[PDB]
């Protein structure tokens, strides 16, 4: 792929934007979790498949036997990777476009982690959207969390529902979804 248009896909807590604790989420939110699965799996058309990205040590806190993620091309950044096709579903690179200059029949490319990774690439001009999950808590400062996004979204747009919606087909997308002491909405954002 040639300057591939990219999508970061987070979870995080507001109103810090905090992503986790200790290399962990500091949640296990089973609805956000089936809707990382939809969104970054369904494609639009037949017979190409997404390209989900992820730092090295992400990967290496996916159980073993749960890596690859399924249905989609799992691409892995270490400063130490050369380039490298591993499998079919398996790439080792250490850029985000260089990787992707190894690639064909992929659709839509999502950034899944972590946070040193969201933090450089919310930086990087290929990235035109974010999805992120606003998690809200009553007692946010009570959740573990050492680990935080720094996003500068004032340079970005949040879109009305309408424009998820388009981004995530026949996707259904529940309002004020809650979980235990947390409630959450999907959004999505672009470029000013
Ligand atoms: N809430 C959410 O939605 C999500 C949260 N997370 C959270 O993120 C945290 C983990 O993030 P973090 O610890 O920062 O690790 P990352 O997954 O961001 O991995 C960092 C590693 O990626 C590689 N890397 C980073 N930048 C580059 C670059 N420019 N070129 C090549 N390789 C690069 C390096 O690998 P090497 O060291 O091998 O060189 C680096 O050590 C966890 O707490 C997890 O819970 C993760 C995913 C989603
Ligand atoms: C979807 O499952 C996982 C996802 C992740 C990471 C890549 C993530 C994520 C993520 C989620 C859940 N929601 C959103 N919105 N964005 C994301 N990037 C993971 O990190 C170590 C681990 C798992 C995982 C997989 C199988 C078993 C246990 C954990």
């Given at each position: 792929?040639?300057?591939?248009?990219?999508?970061?896909?987070?979870?995080?807590?507001?109103?810090?934007?905090?992503?986790?604790?200790?290399?962990?989420?500091?949640?296990?939110?089973?609805?956000?979790?089936?809707?990382?699965?939809?969104?970054?799996?369904?494609?639009?058309?037949?017979?190409?498949?997404?390209?989900?990205?992820?730092?090295?040590?992400?990967?290496?806190?996916?159980?073993?036997?749960?890596?690859?993620?399924?249905?989609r091309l799992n691409i892995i950044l270490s400063?130490?990777?050369?380039?490298?096709?591993?499998?079919?579903?398996?790439?080792?690179?250490?850029?985000?476009?260089?990787?992707?200059?190894?690639?064909?029949?992929?659709?839509?490319?999502?950034?899944?982690?972590?946070?040193?990774?969201?933090?450089?690439?919310?930086?990087?001009?290929?990235?035109?959207?974010?999805?992120?999950?606003?998690?809200?808590?009553?007692?946010?400062?009570?959740?573990?969390?050492?680990?935080?996004?720094?996003?500068?979204?004032?340079?970005?747009?949040?879109?009305?529902?309408?424009?998820?919606?388009?981004?995530?087909?026949?996707?259904?997308?529940?309002?004020?979804?809650?979980?235990?002491?947390?409630?959450?909405?999907?959004?999505?954002?672009?470029?000013?």
């Amino acid at each position: 792929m040639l300057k591939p248009n990219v999508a970061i896909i987070v979870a995080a807590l507001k109103p810090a934007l905090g992503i986790g604790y200790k290399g962990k989420m500091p949640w296990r939110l089973r609805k956000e979790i089936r809707y990382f699965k939809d969104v970054t799996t369904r494609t639009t058309k037949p017979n190409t498949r997404n390209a989900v990205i992820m730092g090295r040590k992400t990967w290496e806190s996916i159980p073993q036997k749960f890596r690859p993620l399924p249905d989609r091309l799992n691409i892995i950044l270490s400063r130490s990777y050369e380039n490298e096709i591993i499998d079919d579903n398996i790439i080792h690179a250490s850029s985000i476009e260089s990787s992707l200059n190894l690639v064909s029949d992929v659709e839509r490319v999502f950034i899944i982690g972590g946070a040193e990774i969201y933090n450089e690439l919310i930086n990087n001009s290929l990235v035109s959207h974010l999805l992120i999950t606003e998690i809200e808590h009553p007692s946010p400062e009570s959740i573990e969390m050492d680990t935080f996004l720094k996003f500068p979204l004032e340079s970005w747009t949040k879109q009305p529902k309408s424009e998820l919606q388009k981004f995530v087909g026949d996707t259904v997308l529940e309002d004020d979804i809650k979980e235990g002491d947390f409630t959450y909405n999907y959004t999505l954002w672009t470029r000013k």
